[PDB]
């Protein structure tokens, strides 16, 4: 089966682990050790295509990787405005102005949202690049994050 290299970029604490490991070990962590990056898979069935996960989760492999999610944390606007930062060096690493992309924004379950999802949204739309909201606690969208990357790796 198809195997799509995916990884997972952001400041610290945006929950890079935490959706990672709610994808594929089903469980939302209580606390990752942030300075452990490996890679991690994942068996799944995408549009009626089985494929293999290969997920990389950066700690703050990295060139090979075919998509990205650019996670930030809704009650986090500094990780918001770091999500630039990590797209320029994605579009250098890969050396591409179009590469396979999502941005995500997590920890949508709490209150204490200081990034709006119009200002997400406007974001993503200047990047042409999908958005979706996540919980790594809840599982919304989840799946949903992830998956939508493997379509955009299909696209391309
Ligand atoms: N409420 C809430 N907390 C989260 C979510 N995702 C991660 N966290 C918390 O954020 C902290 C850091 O998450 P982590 O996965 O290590 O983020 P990372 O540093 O980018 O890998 C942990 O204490 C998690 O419990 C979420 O969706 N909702
Ligand atoms: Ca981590
Ligand atoms: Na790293």
Do not use: W
Request: a negative charge; one cysteine or more.
């Amino acid at each position: 089966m198809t195997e799509y290299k995916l990884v997972v970029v952001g400041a610290g604490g945006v929950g890079k682990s935490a959706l990672t490991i709610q994808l594929i070990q089903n469980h939302f962590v209580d606390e990752y050790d942030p300075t452990i990056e490996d890679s991690y898979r994942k068996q799944v069935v995408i549009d009626g295509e089985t494929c293999l996960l290969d997920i990389l989760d950066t700690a703050g492999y990295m060139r090979t990787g075919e998509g990205f999610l650019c996670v930030f944390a809704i009650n986090n606007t500094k990780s918001f405005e770091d999500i630039h930062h990590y797209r320029e060096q994605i579009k250098r690493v890969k050396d591409s102005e179009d590469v396979p992309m999502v941005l995500v924004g997590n920890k949508c379950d709490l209150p204490s949202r200081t990034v709006d999802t119009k200002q997400a949204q406007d974001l993503a739309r200047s990047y042409g690049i999908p958005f979706i909201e996540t919980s790594a606690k809840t599982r919304q969208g989840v799946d949903d994050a992830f998956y939508t990357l493997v379509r955009e790796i299909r696209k391309h």
